[PDB]
From a paper:
Here we report the cryo-EM structures of the trimeric S proteins from the BA.1, BA.2, BA.3, and BA.4/BA.5 subvariants, with BA.4 and BA.5 sharing the same S protein mutations, each in complex with the surface receptor ACE2. The five sublineages of Omicron exhibit numerous mutations in the S protein, which is responsible for receptor recognition and facilitates fusion with host cells. The RBD may exhibit “up” and “down” conformations in reference to the viral surface, and only the “up” RBD can expose the binding site which is responsible for mediating the interaction with the peptidase domain (PD) of ACE2. This interaction triggers the conformational changes of the trimeric S protein to further expose the fusion peptide in S2, which then facilitates membrane fusion with host cells.
Then, the BA.4/BA.5 sublineages, which share the same S protein mutations (hereafter referred to as BA.5), were identified in Botswana and South Africa, demonstrating even greater transmission advantages compared to the BA.2 subvariant. BA.5 might evolve from BA.2 and has three additional mutations—L452R, F486V, and R493Q—on the RBD. The structures of the ACE2-PD-bound trimeric S proteins from BA.2, BA.3, and BA.5 were determined at overall resolutions of 3.3 Å, 3.4 Å, and 2.8 Å, respectively. In contrast, all three RBDs are “up” in BA.2-SA and BA.5-SA. BA.1 has an additional mutation, G496S, while BA.5 has an additional mutation, F486V. Furthermore, the BA.5 mutation F486V maintains the Van der Waals forces interaction with ACE2, and Gln493 is capable of forming a hydrogen bond with His34 of ACE2. However, this interaction may be influenced by the local environment due to the L452R mutation in BA.5. The compromised neutralization of S2K146 to BA.5 might be directly affected by the mutations, L452R and F486V of BA.5. When aligned the epitopes of S2K146 with WT, BA.2, and BA.5, the F486V obviously disrupts the pie-pie interaction net that involves Phe486 of the RBD, Trp92 of the light chain, and Trp105 and Tyr106 of the heavy chain (left). The L452R could cause a clash with Arg102 of the heavy chain (right).
Author numbering:
A (entry chain A): 736 to 826, 854 to 939, 944 to 1027
B (entry chain C): 590 to 621, 640 to 676, 690 to 735
C (entry chain C): 27 to 66, 81 to 140, 153 to 172, 187 to 210, 215 to 247, 264 to 540
D (entry chain C): 979 to 1076
E (entry chain B): 541 to 589
F (entry chain B): 736 to 784
Write the structure that this text describes.
């Protein structure tokens, strides 16, 4: 938010009065900028956990397991999986500016497709060094061993486990076609931005809310005191906005630290 | 009526005194050489390239800046080297040697107590 | 010729010692890399302070002259320096138009009313400014087209003179047996102090984008990165206004050229209320002999808005037009038409011969001569009862001590100005309680597009 | 200075304005210290957890105790913080087999 | 103390700063007076709270 | 909290003047509701295992 356009709004009498309050705008810009930089850091720590961009082989077929709903589908907007398409399809005023993220959605899709290729072709080896290939049926047998099940139980039932997995994945699109944890973030910030604008129609103990009104019809000595009441009331609104963004920024960071873990 | 922040891109005064300027979400016809249009605004003073480097100074929307090629240049960011795993249905890769690595991690624990 | 300054005209903004502190200051300086005129002479302007550099081992510059008129009849400043020391002086002088054995000082020939006295290659820099009646001089003499470097200038004098300055000249030592002129502008710098407390470097905060970054960060070394330093704001041009057409016109038109006016004792009252009134047809007509606009000015009639307007009309003599005024006396004010003491309208009267006079006498116009008691403001009498000046009643019959109260004007064309008929129209504005009524036309207007406009 | 050049009836108003302004300054300061102290507290909780799980034992948690296979860690003191020296096992020089 | 207009409170002690030969008093970072010069004796004195 | 009852305390002159400050009393209620709903969510997720 540009503090000058919010408080004064293209008014030279008000702009000079802002000089009597000190460095409040300095605090406001730094408070909002300091939490805006962290928002790009939050997304790098979740997705940019792989050094190489891994690709799957063209022969998409892994011991009977069908992964086509989670791997990119070469025939869609940009490059999303059929399931990611459900996820993305289901979800300049007076200084109040919205900045774009550093990573685009196409760039995040490319990080997630590289993680998927690594875990299907290389298991868990690419996260401790070089990616080491191993056939998938043998990866799943190791994974059963790690939970207390012998490996012969998988190899003699391989067809059953592949059938059960393939049906279980196909049920996901029905449950999606849920995301309230993402919609709440958009709605809570939108309501705070709208409330901030609406505080520009309060008198805060002045005769008029419009700066081009008071000064024009009244008396300068009095207009100055009433404009200072508008400045104080609008500054308090704007400072309240910033405090709540810092309190909400900590909640998003706490969630992003859990997602990275 | 058009309006927006103005940012200054600098390689560091210990490298050069060249600079490029980004007009945030300003159309390149309403600003008043090298003019580059990005989704973040108009970048002036930086030569755009087709190659792709590691990000140095982040501009936004996938665009970064660097001091390499000297005046000052722009480009897109590269997610990282590419590599195919040599997967087959009966092949395995096993290490025959190893190294011991040491890495640092730093964590803050306290602030100064004020009254 | 003109030259390019580099980093020159930086002086200690004030007292107050200081150590390693990248301090930011706003004051009147010579901007860095500025366009400074070159002279090798004529009266130069002042406008706001002066930078003055020079170069020469000898001393060619022999003082300055300052002031508003640079002449006699008013006081001025004169600064000279012979081989002894600087001499500040403020008197009323008479300056030679070309001021300049080994005998000298042919600069002036008068020194009246002195209000201040004082007695006591190479680069000699000066900064002159004049704020709140104080004439400050900074200077420094440093030994070596000017070169390139930085050197801050220290206060020299403090002179509580009071003198105004708008122009000045220079004085040179002629041969009988080179200087610069800059001006100061309000700028902001970031000043670097050393541990001894002197200014060693500066940044001009209104030149290169890198300097704006240095000033925002409060440093002279910026680390690699991207810094938000300021903002871009498009500015609007022109002022577009756009009000409706017009419609009505508040028929003043017929009040002023009505083919008959009334006798002063039986005047008229038209009350126009629903109107857009254009008083320009009145003001820009001007055949008028009298125009006395009392409460409001004749120019601000097109930006107010009243509730009612009452326009009166009658015909009187010429030497009675002066009785139409708030606070008066006479046969016309007391008995015929009285304006209150707080009148807020404006009377307008003009001559009416050739349409009221008659060769043989025009007796159609009358007026009241006898009344028991004076009228009230805006009262009107039409009684025709016989006035009684005696002690006996006369029963509505004229005779001795019983007069008919309404005499007649006998207007003939071969009269004298001041006996000829005059048509008068007094206006009266009031705003009782109704929250809209007659008010004039806004004014010009227009339109445009695809442009940021106000 | 207010008193020096003004009567009490009007000086109480002028001083009350300054008091309100500077009292708002203190409320801003203390609110931010509480929000920022919660962040350093969350960091101290993470550092204490790693001290237990990376230094006093061997962890199987991926990337919690450095990059690679965790062997051991050594603490070092830093001003207002802690530094962990993470010792990891990294395989090298693979060959392919059937 | 009051030094020709400079009003304040604190302990006066001999300083080790060197003013320029036109400066009366000094300020610290954040612009608070921390040293003055005695008009009569022309000596620099620090002001501590 | 009931904003009006704290600030004015059932007084028609104060409560009508209070309307001139906009919607501060709607923000106070939303803030308290948002943290009062999470108190049952916090308990529900610890014990309903
Ligand atoms: C993996 O599952 C996908 C569906 O998620 C299968 O694709 C379908 O194949 C049938 C038979 O050709 C078609 O009728 C459908 O139209 C396909 N769906 C889509 C979205 O294209 C795919 O065949 C399966 N792969 C294997 C190896 O069985
Ligand atoms: C283990 O349970 C699964 C079901 O969860 C059994 O598989 C099903 O068997 C029925 C009866 O033959 C078939 O009609 C279904 O199509 C099977 N489901 C799937 C997904 O294949 C399985 O037979 C059970 N195993 C044993 C040893 O009883
Ligand atoms: C193991 O064999 C695979 C091939 O089956 C090797 O991957 C090949 O590596 C060469 C050299 O880098 C590339 O030019 C080929 O394109 C790769 N083939 C495929 C299919 O990706 C792999 O390098 C071998 N591993 C070792 C240690 O030699
Ligand atoms: C495993 O790697 C190490 C190097 O990291 C090898 O040790 C080196 O061997 C060469 C001879 O091949 C010697 O000249 C070096 O002095 C050894 N380095 C050290 C630090 O001792 C080791 O031989 C490798 N093992 C195998 C089986 O190749
Ligand atoms: C008042 O009335 C007279 C006549 O009644 C107006 O004189 C007119 O002037 C216009 C402009 O030249 C002529 O076109 C008309 O022919 C005139 N009238 C006649 C009857 O010939 C006079 O202009 C009127 N006053 C104003 C202010 O318009
Ligand atoms: C910074 O400047 C120093 C000299 O003052 C030099 O040694 C160093 O290489 C410079 N750093 C860079 C990144 O250029
Ligand atoms: C700038 O305006 C022109 C039209 O004048 C338009 O063609 C162009 O797309 C605009 N640029 C942006 C980034 O919107
Ligand atoms: C980059 O490549 C495109 C084609 O993909 C070409 O049109 C464009 O001119 C190139 N840009 C430069 C700077 O060479
Ligand atoms: C200074 O400005 C004048 C016009 O006012 C111009 O003629 C002159 O060339 C300029 N000088 C320099 C050094 O640019
Ligand atoms: C120097 O000039 C001043 C001013 O004219 C004069 O009063 C003084 O006597 C001069 N000194 C000498 C030695 O002439
Ligand atoms: C200034 O001098 C004139 C004579 O030239 C004299 O009439 C006037 O009184 C003087 N003014 C003052 C203030 O002495
Ligand atoms: C200087 O001139 C201005 C008008 O330009 C005038 O108002 C002012 O009083 C003058 N100052 C003095 C000290 O005479
Ligand atoms: C002042 O600083 C200069 C270096 O800029 C040094 O040569 C000189 O000795 C210093 N003098 C004092 C009194 O600090």
């Amino acid at each position: 938010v540009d503090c000058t356009m919010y408080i004064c709004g293209d008014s030279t009498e008000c702009s000079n009065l802002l000089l009597q309050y000190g460095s409040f705008c300095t605090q406001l810009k730094r408070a909002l900028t300091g939490i805006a930089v962290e928002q790009d850091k939050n997304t790098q720590e979740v997705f940019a956990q792989v050094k190489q961009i891994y690709k799957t082989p063209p022969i998409k077929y892994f011991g009977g397991f069908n992964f086509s709903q989670i791997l990119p589908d070469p025939s869609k907007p940009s490059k999303r999986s059929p399931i990611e398409d459900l996820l993305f399809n289901k979800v300049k005023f007076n200084g109040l500016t919205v900045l774009p993220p550093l990573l685009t959605d196409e760039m995040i899709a490319q990080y997630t497709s590289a993680l998927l290729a690594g875990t299907i072709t290389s298991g868990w080896t690419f996260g401790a060094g070089p990616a080491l290939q191993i056939p998938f049926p043998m990866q799943m047998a190791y994974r059963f061993n790690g939970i207390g099940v012998t490996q012969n139980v998988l190899y003699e039932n391989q067809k059953l486990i592949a059938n059960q997995f393939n049906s279980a994945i196909g049920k996901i699109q029905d449950s999606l076609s849920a995301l309230g944890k993402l919609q709440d973030v958009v709605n809570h910030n939108a309501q705070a931005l709208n409330t901030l604008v609406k505080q520009l129609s309060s008198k805060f103990g002045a005769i008029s809310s419009v700066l081009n009104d008071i000064l024009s019809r009244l008396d300068p000595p009095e207009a100055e005191v009433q404009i200072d009441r508008l400045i104080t009331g609008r500054l308090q609104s704007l400072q309240t906005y910033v405090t709540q963004q810092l309190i909400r920024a900590a909640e998003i960071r706490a969630s992003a630290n859990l997602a990275a873990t | 009526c058009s309006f927006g922040g103005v940012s200054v891109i600098t390689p560091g005064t210990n490298t050069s005194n060249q600079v490029a300027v980004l007009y945030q979400g300003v159309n390149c016809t309403e600003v008043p050489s090298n003019v580059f249009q990005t989704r973040a605004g108009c970048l002036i003073g930086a030569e755009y390239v087709n190659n792709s480097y590691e990000c140095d100074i982040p501009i936004g929307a996938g665009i970064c800046a660097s001091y390499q090629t000297q005046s000052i240049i722009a480009y897109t960011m590269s997610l990282g080297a590419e590599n195919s795993v040599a997967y087959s249905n009966n092949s395995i890769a096993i290490p025959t040697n190893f190294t011991i690595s040491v890495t640092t991690e730093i964590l803050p624990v306290s602030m100064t107590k004020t009254s | 010729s003109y030259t390019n300054s580099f980093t020159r005209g930086v002086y200690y903004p004030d007292k107050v010692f200081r150590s390693s502190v990248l301090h930011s200051t706003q004051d009147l300086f010579l901007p860095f890399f500025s366009n400074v005129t070159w002279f090798h002479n004529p009266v130069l302007p002042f406008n706001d302070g002066v930078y003055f550099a020079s170069t020469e081992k000898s001393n060619i510059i022999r003082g300055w002259i300052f002031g508003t008129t640079l002449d006699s009849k008013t006081q001025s400043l004169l600064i000279v320096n012979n081989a002894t020391n600087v001499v500040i002086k403020v008197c009323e002088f008479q300056f030679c138009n070309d001021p300049f054995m080994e005998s000298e000082f042919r600069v002036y020939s008068s020194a009246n009313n002195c209000t201040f006295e004082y007695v006591s290659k190479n680069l000699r820099e000066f900064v002159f400014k004049n704020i709140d009646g104080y004439f400050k001089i900074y200077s420094k003499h440093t030994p070596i087209d000017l070169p390139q470097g930085f050197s801050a200038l220290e206060p020299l004098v403090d002179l509580p003179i009071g003198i105004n300055i708008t122009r000045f000249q220079t004085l040179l030592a002629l041969h009988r047996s080179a200087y610069y002129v800059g001006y100061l502008q309000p700028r902001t710098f970031l000043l670097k102090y050393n541990e001894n407390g002197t200014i060693t470097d500066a940044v001009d905060c209104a030149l290169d984008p890198l300097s704006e970054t240095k000033c925002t960060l409060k440093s002279f070394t910026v680390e690699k990165g991207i810094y938000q330093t300021s903002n871009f704001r498009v500015q609007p041009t022109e002022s577009i206004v756009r009000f409706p057409n017009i419609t009505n016109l508040c028929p003043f038109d017929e009040v002023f050229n009505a083919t008959r006016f009334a006798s002063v004792y039986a005047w008229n009252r038209k009350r126009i209320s629903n109107c857009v009134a254009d008083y320009s047809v009145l003001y820009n007509f001007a055949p008028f002999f009298a125009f006395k606009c009392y409460g409001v000015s004749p120019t601000k009639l097109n930006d107010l808005c009243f509730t009612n307007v009452y326009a009166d009309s009658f015909v009187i003599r010429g030497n009675e037009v002066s009785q139409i005024a708030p606070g008066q006396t006479g046969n016309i004010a007391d008995y015929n038409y009285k304006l209150p003491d707080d009148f807020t309208g404006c009377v307008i009267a003009w001559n009416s011969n050739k349409l009221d006079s008659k060769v043989g006498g025009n007796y159609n116009y009358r007026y009241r001569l006898f009344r028991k008691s004076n009228l009230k403001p805006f009262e009107r009498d039409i009684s025709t009862e016989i006035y009684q000046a005696g002690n006996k009643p006369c029963n509505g019959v004229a005779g001795v001590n019983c007069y008919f109260p309404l005499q007649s004007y006998g207007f003939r064309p071969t009269y004298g100005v001041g006996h000829q008929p005059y048509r008068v129209v007094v206006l009266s504005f009031e705003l009782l309680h109704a929250p809209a009524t007659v008010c004039g036309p806004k004014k010009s207007t227009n339109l445009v597009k695809n442009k940021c406009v106000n | 200075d207010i008193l020096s050049r003004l009567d009490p009836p009007e000086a109480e108003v002028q001083i009350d304005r300054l008091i309100t302004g500077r009292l708002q300054s203190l409320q801003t300061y203390v609110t931010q210290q509480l929000i920022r102290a919660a962040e350093i507290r969350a960091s101290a909780n993470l550092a204490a957890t790693k001290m237990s799980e990376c230094v006093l034992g061997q962890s199987k948690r991926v990337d919690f105790c450095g990059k690679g296979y965790h062997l051991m860690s050594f603490p070092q003191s830093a001003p207002h913080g802690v530094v962990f020296l993470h010792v990891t096992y990294v395989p090298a020089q693979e060959k392919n087999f059937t | 103390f009051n030094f020709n207009g400079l009003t304040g409170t604190g302990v006066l002690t001999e300083s080790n700063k060197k003013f320029l030969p036109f400066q009366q008093f000094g300020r610290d970072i954040a612009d608070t007076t921390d040293a003055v010069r005695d008009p009569q004796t022309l000596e620099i004195l620090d002001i501590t709270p």
